[PDB]
Amino acid sequence: KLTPAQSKNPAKNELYLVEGDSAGGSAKQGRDRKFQAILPLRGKVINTAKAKMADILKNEEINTMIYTIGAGVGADFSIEDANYDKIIIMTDADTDGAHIQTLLLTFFYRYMRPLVEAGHVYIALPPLYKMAYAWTDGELEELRKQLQRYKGLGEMNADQLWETTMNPETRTLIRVTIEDLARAERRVNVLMGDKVEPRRKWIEDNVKFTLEENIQNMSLEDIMGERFGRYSKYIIQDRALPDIRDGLKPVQRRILYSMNKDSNTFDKSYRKSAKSVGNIMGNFHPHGDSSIYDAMVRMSQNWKNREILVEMHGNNGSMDGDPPAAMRYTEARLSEIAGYLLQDIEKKTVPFAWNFDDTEKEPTVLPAAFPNLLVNGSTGISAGYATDIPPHNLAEVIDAAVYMIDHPTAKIDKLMEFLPGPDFPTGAIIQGRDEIKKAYETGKGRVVVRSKTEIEKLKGGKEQIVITEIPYEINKANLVKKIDDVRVNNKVAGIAEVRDESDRDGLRIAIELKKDANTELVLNYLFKYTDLQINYNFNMVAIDNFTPRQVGIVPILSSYIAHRREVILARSRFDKEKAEKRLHIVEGLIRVISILDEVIALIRASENKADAKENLKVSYDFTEEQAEAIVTLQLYRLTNTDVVVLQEEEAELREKIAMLAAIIGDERTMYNLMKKELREVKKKFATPRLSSLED
Amino acid sequence: KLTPAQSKNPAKNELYLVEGDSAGGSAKQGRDRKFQAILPLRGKVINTAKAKMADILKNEEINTMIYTIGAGVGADFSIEDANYDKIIIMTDADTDGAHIQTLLLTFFYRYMRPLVEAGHVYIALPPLYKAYAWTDGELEELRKLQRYKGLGEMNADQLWETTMNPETRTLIRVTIEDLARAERRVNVLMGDKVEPRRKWIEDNVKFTNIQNMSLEDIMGERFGRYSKYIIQDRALPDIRDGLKPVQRRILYSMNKDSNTFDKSYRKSAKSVGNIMGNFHPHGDSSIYDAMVRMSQNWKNREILVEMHGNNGSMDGDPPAAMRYTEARLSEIAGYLLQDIEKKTVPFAWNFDDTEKEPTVLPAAFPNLLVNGSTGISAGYATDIPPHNLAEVIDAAVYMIDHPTAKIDKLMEFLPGPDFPTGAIIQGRDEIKKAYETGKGRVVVRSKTEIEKLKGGKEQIVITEIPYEINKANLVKKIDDVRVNNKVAGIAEVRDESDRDGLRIAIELKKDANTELVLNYLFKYTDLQINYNFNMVAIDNFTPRQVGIVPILSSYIAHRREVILARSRFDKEKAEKRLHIVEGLIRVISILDEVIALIRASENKADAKENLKVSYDFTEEQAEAIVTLQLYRLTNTDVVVLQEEEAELREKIAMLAAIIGDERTMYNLMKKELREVKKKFATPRLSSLED
DNA sequence: CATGAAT
DNA sequence: AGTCATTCATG
DNA sequence: CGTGCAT
DNA sequence: GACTATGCACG
Ligand SMILES: N[C@@H]1[C@H]2CN(c3nc4c(cc3F)c(=O)c(C(=O)O)cn4-c3ccc(F)cc3F)C[C@@H]12
Ligand SMILES: N[C@@H]1[C@H]2CN(c3nc4c(cc3F)c(=O)c(C(=O)O)cn4-c3ccc(F)cc3F)C[C@@H]12
Ligand SMILES: [Mg+2]
Ligand SMILES: [Mg+2]
Ligand SMILES: [Mg+2]
Ligand SMILES: [Mg+2]
């Protein structure tokens, strides 16, 4: 993987540690083979503060580093036998680039202090903008007086990378200096160590979620602080955790908003996946195609989502975990229900933002015509926080929300008469009313999920245990192996043979027992020692007001209602303004009919368009907007001189405006709309429970 | 790789040989695990009739079959020690699937005859449309409509009912009707000798519950199908615009998406996806690789695609994946598409029948020669070097004025190939032979230069190398000479190429015959190679070995078609307008009566009918008149309109003349060809020697 | 052995 | 996101 | 261990 | 077109 320099020289030769092969390539070319070596880093580097020193020695990335640098590692580290005088870390100028600098620095610290303490560890700062060339937004505006936003290294040409960051005379480097051995140790541990509590706290103290954001020296304590801070913030807000209102992670939201913009919906032909992904990756989500597709695939799997938001034709995976077809084979499109998440988006009902390009606005949250967060759930791993929200029956969640709208201050006990608990797509049995309450109240709670079973008598006095429903998030294939392993190992007596018998229209696992076999002894052992029964831990974290918040039912349902409120208000203002303008025009038209000839005469007498309008104003007191409409009518309209039809539209419009004003100017009338609409969604999408409950 | 059947049973168990892992998945899903096993084939099976039985034994796909079959191979083959009653071959219902069925059949014939002779080899017949239909006629019956482009697009539940269910599926049972009449066909289609195949293709291929089929007949409808496709719609360029179908789609799609040289770069993945979705129904990787190649200036004399980012190097290291790179058409590429919006070129339906695509581009310049092509199908192949834009055009221009121009004269304008990697081309005679018959072997030699050093030691400095030669591999093979001391003299080998220059230095030892060495490297490394012309293209839907003349005539013919087409289009436009403008000028003469007649009309339709009947306006005019906006009624100036009426009449005159006068037309075609030359002309890179 | 659209 | 093997014609 | 967006 | 390792929190 190493691309050596032509000659050796432990005094001039540099070692660029590049993020990714493709960038490691553009570097191999742009470099100067005389003294600049290249060593690509494929993937995120192993955290040498958490992983066991055993898994560390086995990591190819690390071992090949301790070698090429050539000076051993840790205690047996002689700074004299090194091969490079400068180790330059070069990553994308993105958040994941920051994460890498972090993971790396904690390594050159722990197992190569000497190297960093000597100021031999630098950090290449690639340019962010290119008009022109500038690093800070400030240097930007200056070049505009005298832009290709670089989202990564793979975007720039070789002769581009050399001139801007690779040329020792034209580049800028943040030389890592250890200014305080003590204040640097505590800084690294808090961020990279095992303990999670401290790290979570440190983020809560330093990271401001509510607000925004030639070689120069910089402390490790300060460097590790700045970098990990960024990666922290970004991963928390814009990656791992769902928005409390629409229950979507940014990637899922873009997949939907994109597919919808491209008219790729349930009422229309399937569109090839590779085409959907590509448009998403080029307009909204600047990340690996594979991730985008994987995300899109999951939204389509009915054994992971209680209400799939994407319909996909072809091999889209299975409960056995076997891989789905690549994006070149599959077709896809939004499910009908997903359409309800996007309802009214064209009506200015949601806060939009700019995309990485700055070429197109994207929604920060979707209108959500139903409480997606609870219905489909989420999960759920970031930095300092994590989330596991289970799926819920669409109807129940709605019955709850509708209640809470009439009773703002409802307690959990009353809500649970509507929302008894989770409803897994995979069905099965949920035990633990108490812990459910605890979860619905605090966000955390441990429940038990047990497989749905049944006994079948067989010839020869033999019995047979049959499993027809398994626990959420459990791999059928592996479960079957683990059970068969019980038999093979004889950890419990009486298992004759295991057999996955499920087919395209039914799940079925037959655990055939032996002649004289205690089928109760077996069924119990399996529940306890395999995943026929498991623990599900509610850990409901979500993003509220830009910050990660551990939340229960109340905060969720209220944040939703809140949101729906803003949306319906906005929607109603939009539709009113439209009806006002149209009402205005229709009013003018009805006048025009009574003076048709005069108006034609008056336009004939006019010199041009503008003059016609002034005459229409001065002579008949029409408004600008009314004159503009009259003057631009096509001649044939003079054949449709029918006032009663117009008067019907006038009336229909006044009424529409009345009802919209009522919504806008009265909170109760608005809340009734929410209820009316929520019930409609309920009637149209309602479906029976799949998971039964037990206490 | 195998997914086995629950219970072992030689009497009922079926073994599905599926094309691809993806389809292999959908199969495991919609299958009946009781007795149906699955075995994916990852890539084209190895031709067990062309390759050595040595490399044939070291084949994973082949081994796991001999193992999964469980009857061994060759002569040590017991049909009683098998594992399946039926061995089903299940591929896509496309051309490449057909080719796969062909490869697996020559294996089961050459190394498991008894299995085939026992009618145990079948072939699944997936549906082609969807009620489901296999025949284009069985659809019309269901008319009283999706098109499967592969197994992937089929949900596992549909797969079962239509092609996997023994009680609902259709199977072609392979049977050897004549062992002697079938030995020839397999030997000819899959043999090592080309000539017999080429001919077979010529003679037969016309470029224009279960059922038994012979091995002879089954190997025909299949290889015949694949041959025709890989020839017309894959490996070989159209003789006119010099593009293969993939490249044409890449350009056309990108162009339709407005992803051009004068606009911001678009993400590669976004383009590729749009291509694969609307036009080219194949791998996104291939499509990308093609797009990338069209952007590499050491492989194209005139790049058609500009691509920001790591698109590769002469060292041949991989380009950034399409997730990283952005791209757009080059300005010259624009000229390949020039006038495409003016119905100047034959369109057809895409695979999806949802959108039309062009079958050839207008080609405002002779791409086929300028950029070349290459070049491997079935029974045919192609190698066409790139040429100097200016030179090719000079020839075309001359041949326009002198249709029957001899090649000797044409070579005063088009002296020979002009590789973008420069270097030295040797063989005036062979160059002619090539321009004359389409074949010819020329020599390409690296641009060398000696540099004396300090100590009586010289040094060889290469500045240019042979087209299609990997710089990194060359430098290795040269250094291998030094390491092996095949010839004495070489001191060290240094690739000293930088971002702005190509330089390989071969330092020599003191008192070392630097002639002997340079000669050895020319012979035993790619410092010097033979380039073989094999100019094959597609003319009138068929492959044709051609020379400089047919190529240039085919071009000129085409340009004629385009220019004629383009002119009819612009003329029809000017006409329709001029026609409308006549009515408007008239209307003004009778404005009040016309408003009156509209005011008296019952509706739009009635108003037009009144205009025609009472004032003799035409439909087109009544529509224009009746959809005027009221404010028009303010105007009464006829002069401005008359000026437009004049301008249009002149444009129609000139355009008509181009269509009625062959000379006026050719003049035009020359005029433009020259503008292109003046705009994109560049100096020679390769030097010529005899 | 490479080449370049394919699986 | 690189890597691995095969087709086809050709010298 | 294995989850799901990232590299 | 599958395979291969990492981060991050959590039982
Ligand atoms: N020593 C470690 C190399 C890198 N490995 C994997 N890389 C994957 C992936 C999977 C890997 F095992 C991906 O799945 C992926 C993607 O975009 O989906 C990108 N990559 C990926 C590949 C290269 C790279 F530089 C960065 C990446 F994120 C494993 C061994
Ligand atoms: N025994 C041989 C399998 C197939 N291998 C490769 N496959 C590639 C590719 C490269 C391979 F080495 C590709 O490059 C590719 C593509 O679309 O670009 C598709 N494929 C590809 C992979 C799997 C498959 F089923 C069909 C394919 F075309 C290697 C081992
Ligand atoms: Mg990046
Ligand atoms: Mg991946
Ligand atoms: Mg196919
Ligand atoms: Mg490939």
Q: What does B516-544 look like in DSSP terms, one character per residue?
A: HHHHHHHHHSTTEEEEEEE-EEEETTEEE
Residue B47 structural domain: 1-214
**Phi, psi angle pair for A129, to nearest 5°:** -120, 155
Domain boundary residue among A165, A186, A219? A219
Cα–Cα distance, B421 to B298 (Å, whole number)? 6
What is the CB-side half-sphere exposure of residue A158 using CA atoms within 13 A? 19
Q: Evaluate whether B556 touches B363 at the Cβ level (below 8 Å).
A: no
Domain boundary residue among B147, B180, B214? B214
What is the CB-side half-sphere exposure of residue B556 using CA atoms within 13 A? 25
Cα–Cα distance, A658 to A165 (Å, whole number)? 63
Task: Measure B189 CA to nearest chain A CA, in Å.
Answer: 30
Find the residue closest to D10 using CA and C1' atoms.
B381
Distance B197 CA to ligand 4 centre (A): 44
* Residue environment code for B367-392, b if the CB has 16+ CB neighbours within 10 A, otherwise e: bbbbbbbbbebbbbbbbbbbbbbbbb
Residue A484 sits at the chain B interface (C-beta within 8 Å)? no
Separation of CA B259 from chain center: 20
Task: Judge if the beta carbon of A481 is closer than 7 A to nucleic acid strand E.
Answer: no
Task: Measure B246 CA to nearest chain A CA, in Å.
Answer: 16
Cα–Cα distance, B190 to B212 (Å, whole number)? 22
Taking Cα atoms as reference points, which of A270, A392, A275, A430 lies closest to residue A335? A270
Is residue B224 one of the residues assigned to a domain?
A: no
Separation of CA A384 from chain center: 17
Cα–Cα distance, A154 to B265 (Å, whole number)? 14
Distance A329 CA to ligand 5 centre (A): 9
Q: Evaluate whether B276 touches A272 at the Cβ level (below 8 Å).
A: yes
CATH number at residue A170: 3.40.50.670
Q: Are residues A457 and A333 located together in one domain of the fold?
A: no
In chain B, the N- to C-terminal Cα span, in Å, equals: 58
Separation of CA A195 from chain center: 26
Question: Where on the phi/psi map is residue B545: left (φ > 0), alpha (ψ -120 to 50), or beta?
Answer: beta
H helix intervals, B373-424: 389-401, 407-410
Distance B469 CA to C3 C1' (A): 10
Chain A environment of B325 (Cβ under 8 Å): 154-155
Torsion of CA A429, A430, A431, A436, to 10 degrees: -170
What are the structure tokens assigned to A324, written together? 């789905």
In angstroms, the Cα distances linking B645 to A206, B635, B655 are 74, 17, 16
What are the structure tokens assigned to B529, written together? 């190679």
Question: Where on the phi/psi map is residue B236: left (φ > 0), alpha (ψ -120 to 50), or beta?
Answer: beta
* The amino acid at B91: T
Is residue B586 one of the residues assigned to a domain?
A: yes
Q: Evaluate whether B518 touches B529 at the Cβ level (below 8 Å).
A: no
Give residues with Cβ within 8 angstroms of B363, minimum separation 6.
B240, B241, B242, B336, B555, B558, B559, B562
Q: Is B682 helix (H, G, I), strand (E, B) or coil?
A: coil
Q: Which residue of B has its CA nearest to A271?
A: B277
Active site (catalytic) residues of A: 329
Cα–Cα distance, B555 to B558 (Å, whole number)? 5
In angstroms, the Cα distances linking A155 to A30, A128, B83, B258 are 13, 11, 54, 21
Domain total for chain B? Answer: 4
Q: Is B494 helix (H, G, I), strand (E, B) or coil?
A: strand
- Using alpha carbons only, what angle is made at residue B464 by residues B460 and B469, rounded to the nearest 5 degrees? 110
Domain boundary residue among A157, A191, A219? A219
Nucleotide nearest to B282 (CA to C1'): C6
Q: Are residues B86 and B42 located together in one domain of the fold?
A: yes
Separation of CA A391 from chain center: 17
What are the structure tokens assigned to A317, written together? 């995976």
Task: Judge if the beta carbon of A206 is closer than 7 A to nucleic acid strand E.
Answer: no
Cα–Cα distance, A304 to A330 (Å, whole number)? 19
Residue whose token pair is 């950890």: A491
Cα–Cα distance, B678 to B690 (Å, whole number)? 29
What are the structure tokens assigned to B389, written together? 């834009």
Taking Cα atoms as reference points, which of B492, B229, B247, B528 lies closest to residue B363? B247
Distance B96 CA to ligand 5 centre (A): 6
Taking Cα atoms as reference points, which of B187, B596, B521 lies closest to residue A604? B596
Examine residue B416 and say whether the peptide bond preceding it is cis (omega within 30 degrees of 0).
no
Express the helix, strand and coil content of chain B in percent, nearest 5 each.
50, 15, 35
Residue pairs spanning A and B at CB distance below 8 A: 214
What are the structure tokens assigned to B23, written together? 């389809």
In angstroms, the Cα distances linking A223 to A217, A230, B538 are 10, 11, 62
Taking Cα atoms as reference points, which of A176, A279, A257 lies closest to residue A223? A176
Task: Judge if the beta carbon of A17 is closer than 7 A to nucleic acid strand E.
Answer: no
Residue B593 sits at the chain A interface (C-beta within 8 Å)? no
Chain B environment of A272 (Cβ under 8 Å): 273, 276-277
Q: Is B398 helix (H, G, I), strand (E, B) or coil?
A: helix
Q: Which of B19, B42, B46, B276 has most ligand 2 atoms within 8 Å of its beta carbon, as the pocket-test mutant? A: B42
- Using alpha carbons only, what angle is made at residue A478 by residues A473 and A483, rounded to the nearest 5 degrees? 115
Is residue B64 one of the residues assigned to a domain?
A: yes
What are the structure tokens assigned to B679, written together? 């705009």
Give residues with Cβ within 8 angstroms of A290, minimum separation 6.
none
Taking Cα atoms as reference points, which of A280, A388, A391, A255 lies closest to residue A333? A255
Q: Evaluate whether A480 touches A495 at the Cβ level (below 8 Å).
A: no
Give residues with Cβ within 8 angstroms of B633, minimum separation 6.
A600, A603, A604, A635, B591, B595
In chain A, the N- to C-terminal Cα span, in Å, equals: 58
Taking Cα atoms as reference points, which of B145, B567, B605 lies closest to residue A640? B605
Q: Which residues of B spanning 141-170 put their CB closer than 7 angstroms to strand F?
A: 152
* The amino acid at A58: K
Q: Are residues B590 and B456 located together in one domain of the fold?
A: no
Cα–Cα distance, B571 to B577 (Å, whole number)? 10
Between chains, do A633 and B630 touch, taking CB under 8 Å as contact?
yes
Residue whose token pair is 């300090």: B454
Q: Which nucleotides of E are covered by protein (CB under 7 A)?
A: 2-7
Q: Evaluate whether B207 touches B162 at the Cβ level (below 8 Å).
A: no
Q: Are residues A317 and A438 located together in one domain of the fold?
A: yes
For ligand 1, whether the C-beta of A44 sits within 6 Å is no
Give residues with Cβ within 8 angstroms of B60, minimum separation 6.
none
What are the structure tokens assigned to A141, written together? 């505006």
Taking Cα atoms as reference points, which of A148, A176, A178, A179 lies closest to residue A164? A148
Cα–Cα distance, A243 to A263 (Å, whole number)? 24
Instruction: Find out whether A423 is annotated in a ligand binding site.
Output: no
Q: Are residues A106 and A206 located together in one domain of the fold?
A: yes
Cα–Cα distance, B366 to B672 (Å, whole number)? 12
With breaks defined as C to next N over 2.5 Å, after which residues does chain B break?
A: 130, 144, 208
Sign (positive or negative) of CA dihedral A548, A549, A550, A553: negative
Q: Write down how long chain A is.
A: 695
β pairing state of B210-214 and B171-175 = parallel
Is residue B223 one of the residues assigned to a domain?
A: no
In angstroms, the Cα distances linking A292 to A95, A153, A255, A296, A410 are 18, 20, 8, 6, 39
Is residue B220 one of the residues assigned to a domain?
A: no
Q: Are residues B40 and B112 located together in one domain of the fold?
A: yes
Question: Where on the phi/psi map is residue B616: left (φ > 0), alpha (ψ -120 to 50), or beta?
Answer: left
DSSP string, B429-488: HHHHHHHHHSEEEEEEE-B--B---TTS--EEEE-B--TT--HHHHHHHHHHHHHHTSST
Cα–Cα distance, A19 to B562 (Å, whole number)? 50
Sheet with A331-334, strands from edge to edge, namely A271-272, A331-334, A310-313
In angstroms, the Cα distances linking B370 to B336, B388, B396, B561, B687 are 12, 6, 12, 21, 16
Sign (positive or negative) of CA dihedral A399, A401, A404, A406: negative
Q: Are residues A485 and A552 located together in one domain of the fold?
A: no
Radius of gyration for chain B, computed over Cα atoms and rounded to the nearest angstrom: 32
Q: Is B78 helix (H, G, I), strand (E, B) or coil?
A: coil
DSSP B321: P
Taking Cα atoms as reference points, which of B149, B63, B164 lies closest to residue B107? B63
Q: Are residues A254 and A167 located together in one domain of the fold?
A: no
Is residue A229 one of the residues assigned to a domain?
A: no
* Residue environment code for B581-598, b if the CB has 16+ CB neighbours within 10 A, otherwise e: bbbbebbbeeeeebbebb
Is residue A345 one of the residues assigned to a domain?
A: yes
Cα–Cα distance, A75 to A20 (Å, whole number)? 30
What are the structure tokens assigned to B84, written together? 């399946």
Q: List B266's β-bridge partners, or say none.
A: B327
Q: List A272's β-bridge partners, or say none.
A: A331
Give residues with Cβ within 8 angstroms of B554, minimum separation 6.
B239, B240, B537, B539, B546
Task: Judge if the beta carbon of A239 is closer than 7 A to nucleic acid strand E.
Answer: yes
Q: Evaluate whether B383 touches B534 at the Cβ level (below 8 Å).
A: yes
DSSP string, A508-557: -EEEEE-TT--HHHHHHHHHHHSTTEEEEEEE-EEEETTEEEE--HHHHH
Nucleotide nearest to B233 (CA to C1'): C5
Give residues with Cβ within 8 angstroms of A337, minimum separation 6.
A307, A308, A309, A370, A685
β pairing state of A352-354 and A378-381 = unpaired
Burial class (CB within 10 angstroms; exposed 0-12, middle 13-18, buried 19+) of A434: exposed
What is the CB-side half-sphere exposure of residue A645 using CA atoms within 13 A? 5
Q: Which nucleotides of C are covered by protein (CB under 7 A)?
A: 2-7
Sheet with A36-41, strands from edge to edge, namely A36-41, A14-19, A86-90, A121-123
- Using alpha carbons only, what angle is made at residue A655 by residues A654 and A657, rounded to the nearest 5 degrees? 65
CATH number at residue B244: 3.90.199.10
Separation of CA A99 from chain center: 19
A window 27-46, beta carbon within 8 A of B: 28-30, 32-33
What are the structure tokens assigned to A84, written together? 């490079």
β pairing state of B121-123 and B86-90 = parallel
Give residues with Cβ within 8 angstroms of A487, minimum separation 6.
A495, A496, A497, A498
DSSP B319: P
Q: Are residues A254 and A321 located together in one domain of the fold?
A: yes
Active site (catalytic) residues of B: 324
In A268-385, the DSSP E strands lie at 271-272, 310-313, 331-334, 352-354, 361-363, 378-381
What are the structure tokens assigned to A328, written together? 């070149």
- A279 membership: H or E segment, kind and range: helix A273-283
Chain B environment of A356 (Cβ under 8 Å): none
Residue whose token pair is 């009422």: A267
Q: Evaluate whether A29 touches A6 at the Cβ level (below 8 Å).
A: no
Cα–Cα distance, B225 to B232 (Å, whole number)? 11
Instruction: Find out whether B592 is annotated in a ligand binding site.
Output: no
Which atom of ligand 2 lies at the shortest distance from residue B19's CA? 25
Q: Evaluate whether B251 touches B337 at the Cβ level (below 8 Å).
A: yes
Chain A environment of B152 (Cβ under 8 Å): 314-315, 325, 328-330
Instruction: Find out whether A92 is annotated in a ligand binding site.
Output: yes
- Using alpha carbons only, what angle is made at residue A38 by residues A33 and A42, rounded to the nearest 5 degrees? 155
Residue B598 sits at the chain A interface (C-beta within 8 Å)? yes
Q: Write down how long chain B is.
A: 690
In angstroms, the Cα distances linking A602 to A615, A616, B587, B590 are 7, 8, 19, 18
Residue nearest to atom 7 of ligand 1 (CA): A43
Distance A58 CA to ligand 2 centre (A): 29
Burial class (CB within 10 angstroms; exposed 0-12, middle 13-18, buried 19+) of A460: exposed
DSSP string, A31-78: S-TTTEEEEEE-SSPP-TTTS-HHHHHT-HHHHHHHHHTTS-SGGG--
- A584 membership: H or E segment, kind and range: helix A553-594
**Phi, psi angle pair for B291, to nearest 5°:** -55, -40
Cα–Cα distance, B172 to A515 (Å, whole number)? 46
Burial class (CB within 10 angstroms; exposed 0-12, middle 13-18, buried 19+) of A96: middle
Residue nearest to atom 1 of ligand 2 (CA): B42
Partner-chain residue, chosen from A26, A325, A359, that has the shortest CB–CB distance to B25:
A325
Q: Evaluate whether A443 touches A492 at the Cβ level (below 8 Å).
A: no
In angstroms, the Cα distances linking B324 to A1, B440, B488 are 20, 41, 46
B window 162-181, beta carbon within 8 A of A: none
Q: Are residues A435 and A449 located together in one domain of the fold?
A: no
Q: Are residues A55 and A37 located together in one domain of the fold?
A: yes
In angstroms, the Cα distances linking B374 to A208, A617, B243, B438 are 59, 72, 10, 14
Residue B284 sits at the chain A interface (C-beta within 8 Å)? yes
Is residue B383 one of the residues assigned to a domain?
A: yes
Find the residue closest to D3 using CA and C1' atoms.
B318
Q: Is B512 helix (H, G, I), strand (E, B) or coil?
A: coil
CATH number at residue A587: 1.10.268.10
Task: Judge if the beta carbon of A230 is closer than 7 A to nucleic acid strand E.
Answer: no
Q: To one decimal place, what's the resolution in Å?
A: 3.3
Residue A97 sits at the chain B interface (C-beta within 8 Å)? no
Separation of CA B459 from chain center: 44
What are the structure tokens assigned to B5, written together? 């059947």
Q: Are residues B3 and B141 located together in one domain of the fold?
A: yes
Task: Judge if the beta carbon of A535 is closer than 7 A to nucleic acid strand E.
Answer: no
Chain A environment of B634 (Cβ under 8 Å): 603-604, 606-609, 611-612
Q: Is B636 helix (H, G, I), strand (E, B) or coil?
A: coil
